[PDB]
């Protein structure tokens, strides 16, 4: 409930509680990915979120 | 209600198909033949 996104200091937001069960459906349209630095570049490559 | 932890659902068939189409696009750069392995987050803040 208590979050600081965007590395914000001095302000923390409390997400108020919600009555009942929450259900939501969204589209996953894309990713944010990173490649490992360990190489062995000519061997294989691994990707992570 | 249910005593449970919050959970997120993804259909096995739909995620796989996309992965197969995506993994082929990386080989337009990383070369025709090579091994591409996927893995979860390395480490850091919870947001990451």
């Amino acid at each position, epitope marked *: 409930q208590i979050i600081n996104m965007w590395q914000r200091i001095g302000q923390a937001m409390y997400a108020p509680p919600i009555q009942g*069960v*929450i*259900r939501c459906v969204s589209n996953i349209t894309g990713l944010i990915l990173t490649r490992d630095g360990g190489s062995t570049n000519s061997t294989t490559e691994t990707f992570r979120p | *209600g*249910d*005593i*449970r932890q919050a959970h997120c659902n993804v259909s096995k068939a739909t995620w796989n198909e996309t992965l197969g189409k995506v993994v082929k696009q990386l080989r337009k750069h990383f070369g025709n033949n090579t091994i591409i392995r996927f893995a979860n987050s390395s480490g850091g803040d919870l947001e990451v």
Partner: antibody
Amino acid sequence: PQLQESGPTLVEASETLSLTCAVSGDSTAACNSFWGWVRQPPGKGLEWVGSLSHCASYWNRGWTYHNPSLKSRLTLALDTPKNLVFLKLNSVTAADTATYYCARFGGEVLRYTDWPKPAWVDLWGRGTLVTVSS
Amino acid sequence: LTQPPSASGSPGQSITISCTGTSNNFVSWYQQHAGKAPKLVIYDVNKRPSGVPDRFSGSKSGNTASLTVSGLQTDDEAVYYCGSLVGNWDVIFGGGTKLTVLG
């Protein structure tokens, strides 16, 4: 907390038996217990009828439990604002003649895992005798 | 659930009635006076409800569940039924045990 049963004490065979419980001192909206019926045939043992509850989860609009044998011929209903319980039995026979009790079911109802689990009747009613004759 | 048909005892003695077929801990016992409505005397095995004397105690060993009444008295004469949750959400009752504290 008091449970008052009401309805016809004398019903003819093959007809529809209807009974209504009026709760006093508690809310049918309360998620702490289930509401249903338990019938006790004359000089015989206790038989479970069924119970339901509007307090639902994300995939349903409620929960309703029927006794496997009586399932086809019964319908369970709860009126939340009016705080009333209902029982309807279709195609009734003299074998269904019993003293019907308005029952409040306790158990793992307020905190369950997967589906809710009612196991015992904590609060009873005085009950009424319904005799089915052709 | 299988409950013994009858049970007897003198005032002050302790009676133990059994029940079998309970694989879970949801076992509960009831007391019904003849010509009256049933009243729940125990729940969740051993645990007691409000306004119920200490002398009523529930117990379950293996597949057998047991109720024990010590210090018998006139008001204890009734029919005692046991019940428990089974399967997914269904619940069943035993034949009940008739315990008499007659003269």
